[PDB]
């Protein structure tokens, strides 16, 4: 094994005004002004429930461990941590918050293009911690981040794993789970892929729930008998089709990210013949030197 020689950005609690709470873990929007520099940069700054917790301290270092090894354009990195009484998290701020939240807000608003490209942009981002032999273990739409509407990111490294991988229990999601992860807890890049799966769907359903109103206990059984979640309408059977290759028994005759770019890429220089949706073709505050993280580069 290559040696992670990432940095890990350690900034003082001076450095950022948080600005307005985003959540409740509690999670701020702020600016993060690094010192002399005459940059401001939008940051989402996550801390714990409660300090003095050995258990939760350990969870959020070993999230920014992960995040602090990743430099991908549709993946979200880590600025630095925040060693005060609570630990703070400090990452890019996704201004437009969960790709979930945004379908179902702007379902009358979303066409073929931005479908299709967030599925490749996706793709590409877990097709880079397939390259860093990483497994993310909850790949959903509610863990993928609107930066603009041209432009998601893949978040959420509570499960994240370095390299099969065998767990051992906690509340995780069944909905988004290959079988070979819900039977025996084994979980892949290719585990990963049937969770693509499903994150394409909930996408092409406009945010829908799998499985809606079924118990995970049915879920193991339901998938063993041969059955999958339905052809979403604006569906064509080739974007059907590929997300049902991602929910195969046999993990390996799943697709690959690197194949699944590919695919919807190709369609995506096409997509008003892949996906059929009514009326396809019709679809700050006084601060001067602010800059996106992803134009901030530091050696
Ligand atoms: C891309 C880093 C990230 O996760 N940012 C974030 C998290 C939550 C809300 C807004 N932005």
Redesign the pocket.
């Given at each position: 094994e290559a040696p992670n020689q990432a940095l890990l950005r350690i900034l003082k609690e001076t450095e950022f005004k948080k600005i307005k709470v985003?959540?409740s873990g509690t999670?701020y929007?702020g600016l993060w002004i690094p010192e002399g520099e005459k940059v401001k940069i939008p940051v989402?700054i996550?801390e714990l429930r409660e300090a003095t917790s050995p258990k939760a301290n350990k969870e959020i270092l070993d999230e920014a461990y992960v995040?602090a090894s990743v430099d991908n354009p549709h993946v979200?990195?880590l600025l630095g941590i925040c060693l005060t009484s609570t630990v703070q998290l400090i990452?890019?701020?996704?201004?437009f918050?969960c790709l979930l939240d945004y379908v179902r807000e702007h379902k009358d608003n979303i066409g073929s293009q931005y479908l299709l490209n967030w599925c490749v942009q996706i793709a590409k981002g877990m097709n880079y911690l397939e390259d860093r032999r990483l497994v993310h273990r909850d790949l959903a739409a509610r863990n993928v981040?609107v930066?603009t509407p041209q432009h998601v990111?893949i978040?959420?490294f509570g499960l994240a794993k370095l390299l099969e991988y065998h767990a051992e229990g906690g509340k995780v999601p069944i909905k988004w789970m290959a079988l070979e992860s819900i039977l025996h807890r084994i979980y892949t890049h290719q585990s990963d892929v049937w969770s693509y799966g499903v994150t394409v769907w909930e996408l092409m359903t406009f945010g829908s729930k799998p499985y809606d109103g079924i118990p995970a206990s049915e879920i193991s059984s339901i998938l063993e008998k041969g059955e999958r979640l339905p052809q979403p309408p604006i569906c064509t059977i080739d974007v059907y089709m590929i997300m049902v290759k991602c929910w195969m028994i046999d993990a390996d005759s799943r697709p690959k990210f690197r194949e699944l770019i590919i695919e919807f890429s190709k369609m995506a220089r096409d997509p008003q013949r892949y996906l059929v949706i009514q009326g396809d073709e019709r679809m700050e505050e006084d601060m001067d030197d602010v800059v996106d993280?992803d134009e901030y580069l530091i050696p």
């Open positions: 985003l959540g999670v929007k989402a996550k995040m979200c990195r990452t890019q701020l996704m201004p918050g981040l930066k990111k978040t959420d993280a």
